[model samples]
Target: SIPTVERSTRMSNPWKAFMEKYDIERTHSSGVRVDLGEDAEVENAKYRIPAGRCPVFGKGIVIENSDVSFLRPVATGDQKLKDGGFAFPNANDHISPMTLANLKERYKDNVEMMKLNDIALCRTHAASFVQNSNYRHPAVYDEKEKTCHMLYLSAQENMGFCFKPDKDESFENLVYLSKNVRNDWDKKCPRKNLGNAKFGLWVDGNCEEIPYVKEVEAEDLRECNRIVFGASASDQFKSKGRGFNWANFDSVKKKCYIFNTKPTCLINDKNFIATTALSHPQEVDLEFPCSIYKDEIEREIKGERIVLPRIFISNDKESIKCPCEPERISQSTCNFYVCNCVEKRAEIKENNQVVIKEEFRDYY
Candidate 1:
């Protein structure tokens, strides 16, 4: 029997006090179950809006290896120091405020200025020239400005990235010395005008085997030509083959003559040239047209000297008597002298002698 209507005081809406006293249960009188536990899946049956969807790609994405152009800028008040007054010799008078001002405004968006005092922080230690990551900071010398300019940036990818001027290999030779020279300068500080040191240029036997060896005619070999030196080499064979490779072949004698040398050479190694320089400072030539060869990364790292190895021949070797008579520079409270063969000669004057098989042209 289905009842349609009922009228009674008890069926009226429950009082506020009564509803608060007891909890309501929907499944009690109804056939379908309504109240369920917290983990019930009934509410989650319907589809839901996906979380964090990207329109470009199906999933949210970020570009990898994105180019970052902006560099952290230096403080505005200290821009003067970062702009141009920082080299070993102090270039304050050489820098032009006008040109740098224009450049500052142009690259202000990317380059931030750095203080000269803070240069120590850019690298790991005071002894090193490159940054902690072995990135070398290259600077370009502007003749008009009388100063050098370089750009630097720091990031996870580049670390201490810097843009410097390109060096011309053919024109410039025998430019700088390595740490060994500095150590000597520190120990035996001598007075200025300590005399001049004349460096010589020479080539190894295997001329055609080198990678960057430029094959030139015998007549083209000039004093300006240079060679590379390996600072870490242990033997003559190791350093000779790894250094500069540009050489000339003479069909008559079937001999090879190299035309490479660098401004800086190290005596730390046990090679013939290194050993000769250390052993016999007089006739052996203290200075050699030596250079350093570094790749994009290796160039930025620090080293004591510059290395490679090949079979060295004794007879009919090529040599160059360089005319570079560079005057000595005082360093370490006048305790040492750079570019002074006299000091080296005087020191080795009493050293033991050995049979030096290498020969020179004596063209100086």
Candidate 2:
């Protein structure tokens, strides 16, 4: 059995005193004036509106996650700073006149009127409209103007609400009590009819409506363990019998080689060659094209010398000779005249032995 659901509703009076207090301090100044070096300190002042008082949808309320644009001041007059210079200390800081002027010049009126009123206040108002459900759809009361404002969400531009802050109460009352008003007309009426509607009636542009798919349990393959490729492979024996089925075969020294008329080569085979020739066969050579040794002429100019050991000399006469061969000079004429004796020639043998020896006698 389908359960009957009770709809929720709230009743607000237009003559409420608290709602009408906003218009009490109205000034007829054309534009907002901020004095330089004016020490008008408002201590713990409620400059920004409190949050959580508006409806979450339509005209008087702001949609959550909507693009909220605001103004920022350029310079405030000071020696350290400049004129119209201001910074956004928080998310709800009011935009200065300079910032508003700059935005008006650039965007050319995409900025809303309520947003241009007071930056800090409007930020708090916008934040409250999106965040706090209590203030989401606030009842408008203007005591100074002796009028009431009613807002209704319009379906015209992607689901936004229309704000009418000072509408006649008599006309609003007639529209609210009228039973002949259609659903569409009731939505436009800035009275109890529009406020009493259900949540499903509010259209959300950002939300998606997708059908749910039932989740199926996947089968577990953890236990299906087996060695796939080995001596016991299923197709190992059958694959050997079918040798190169796509091409003709040739018997070369009892070995099979695949033959094809076109230039086709199997990259997987180890001995496959694209072409075969005897004389002047095409060879792929790789050259570095650079010299590895240092410049020999520069090394010689730098006074670099290769020194040999003194043991290469075979005799005391200081004659250079190969280790395997030595000069055999006659000892009769080669002897020194002061000694008046024969000089022996030194010879190096295969076993690196000095075989020749000479003895000299000195007379005093």
Candidate 3:
């Protein structure tokens, strides 16, 4: 503590040493490359410069220095931009007319719930996807039969229509209204039955029961192909609509009469014709002479006959089908070969082999 020593002061020059160690080199006219010190081990150590303001205090003097370093590895393969924000894939697969219709019918209750909740409607209704098939099920092929079945079910559920078949009745039947004057049948009108007469309840028309005939095989009935009943009646007429003709009969106030002939339904009334023909030209035949026949010579020649193949045929056939009875003439018939003559026209110039002037046509 009592030792006497000479006091020597020297200012540290760390900045100057740092600047000389990490020098910035001109890489190009517009770009620059930073070079680290020769003794530095880091490859990008030149960019390791301190950033922001220094902690030293100075009046009216400002020093700006950068000590930042950035490292970016070279991309090895194909590079793609990241997908962000509110973008999504196409929704073409989720949308369809049938889907919309089902949404409306199935989610009826859910729609009401949303309305009460004051919520904006979604693309798909909750009930539509979760509930029943939405009016698409239990489909009917025959329009009239479908209407009848719908009415029957509605009347039975809404009105007090009852299915009644007594012991004496031969068939099961349904009756929405009764014709008996004595009974309280006035309030109930327009009834339907599929049962017998003696013990069958009367709904509409005569109380006679209409027998249910099972459709026969397509080959069994002449001009009749198939018979489809019940819910899917329209499936039978998928390709084309057939026709039907019924024997006209008048019903008296209370008289009951049975029909002898089955009814035939017609599809449409139209005529068809063939307007064009396609043919193949005759082939050329070559006749050759043997070497021994020195005097005879043969040459290749074309045949005169051309063969025409029938691609399509037309007929004035009608579409009609018989129903219920066993009569043969009332059977259904389809004209699949009938070509639309009204829409087709014949071309006279198509058949001409060569141009012919007036007065010279007779020469050919």
Candidate 4:
């Protein structure tokens, strides 16, 4: 036996029902109170409805069927219209002095990925996010030395670059380039970032053998930060037009960016596939209040300062124990090692009261 039934639906929401439903008893729903005339409160509770079909919202919101709630996925002007067609201004209209500048700007609202050289002109590359931590990692960890003497990039992007994510990504992602790949981007490059291509002595649960330029490939001398990887170095990959894709250079050359690969490794200084991290999280620090050095020796190598709390006295007095060995140290030191000596002691007086010691500074 077959049976057919019609779906039914009905509603008789009276003003009272509506009142019970959205009645701002607490005294408000979106901020609107039980009393509609409570204009100010109503305005307070009233939140904007998704007013338009764009990320760019209009001034009006529909009040007829409106009710407020949190988690309004801020109308991300889905440049995409209802017809699945996306809208964007022609990049050519916004060119920077640089060629791809406009192209870069086009996706700036969203995000765009390019190369270290392509983004070379921008500040994101060769930049440092940590306070006083301008150091960058090397091609390899020095086997004997505890820490490697990493390079300080001219700009953060020169090494690898990414846009400052608009929201919800860790700052750590910026350091690791593996997470920055897009779909079949030029397919020649690896799709993912987090890669085992790392040849350094990274933090691996306190195990063993961290070297001073480990072979990591002692196959060579310096840590091979930049090297010949990809099709040549790998068994399953194919080579691109140029070699050293790991860090394919261009109009410019940075010596520290070079490394040596094997004969079977497919030597292509002209073309090579850099083994970027299969991927990393999101884009986007302080020294000792200076830097963290193990001991006096370590401090010297790192050019660190253990700045202890001290009264900044005059040039006649002894200077600070700043371990910073740069062009110079002890800013107050005169020709023959002179220092601060309480020479500029300040004096103060209270309203006909007792002794009031004054602060003495200014390395007088």
In model 2, the runs with Cα more than 4 Å from the true position are 1-98, 111-364
RMSD of each: 37.2, 45.2, 45.9, 31.2
Question: On residues 1-364, what C-alpha lDDT tens digit does candidate 1 reach at each position?
Answer: 4433211111111122211111111101100001011111224352111110000000011113323212212223445433322233323523221234444443356533322112111211122333223233322223234222332221111123322111122212111111111222212211111112211221221111122223333321121121111111112111221223222233333333343332111211111121111111111332321221112113222213222121111111111111244322231122221222211110111111211223322321
When sorted by lDDT, best at the front, the candidate numbers are 1, 4, 2, 3
lDDT per residue, candidate 3, 242-293, as tens digits? Answer: 1111111111122222211121111111111000000001111111111211
**Per-model TM-score versus the true fold:** 0.20, 0.12, 0.12, 0.16
User: What would the C-alpha RMSD of candidate 4 be, to one decimal place?
Assistant: 31.2
Q: Stretches of candidate 3 above 4 Å error? A: 1-136, 139-239, 245-249, 253-364
The 10 consecutive residues of candidate 4 with the worst lDDT sum are 50-59
Q: After superposition, how far is residue 313 of candidate 3 from its true place, in Å?
A: 44
lDDT of predicted model 4:
0.19
The superposed Cα distance between candidate 3 and the true structure at residue 122, in angstroms, equals 23
Question: Please, what are the lDDT tens digits per residue for candidate 4 over residues 1-364?
Answer: 4443221121111122212211111111111000011111223353111100001000011112223211111223454222211111233423211234443554465443453323221223212222333221111111122111111111111112221111112112111111111123222222222121121111111001112211222121111222222111111111211222122212122221222221111111221112211111110000010111122223322333333222221121223232332222232122112122322232222221212134423232
What lDDT is reached at residue 310 by model 2? 19
lDDT of 2 by residue, 1-364 (tens): 5433221121112112311211111110000010011111235332211111111111121222432211122233343321211122233333221233443454355455434322222222222322212222112222223222221111111233221211122222111101111123212211111110100100010001111211112111100000000111112112211111111111111121221111111111112111110000112112211111112112322332332221211122222223334433332122111111222233323322333333312220
Q: lDDT of each model, Cα atoms only? A: 0.20, 0.19, 0.16, 0.19
Model 4 quality (TM-score): 0.16
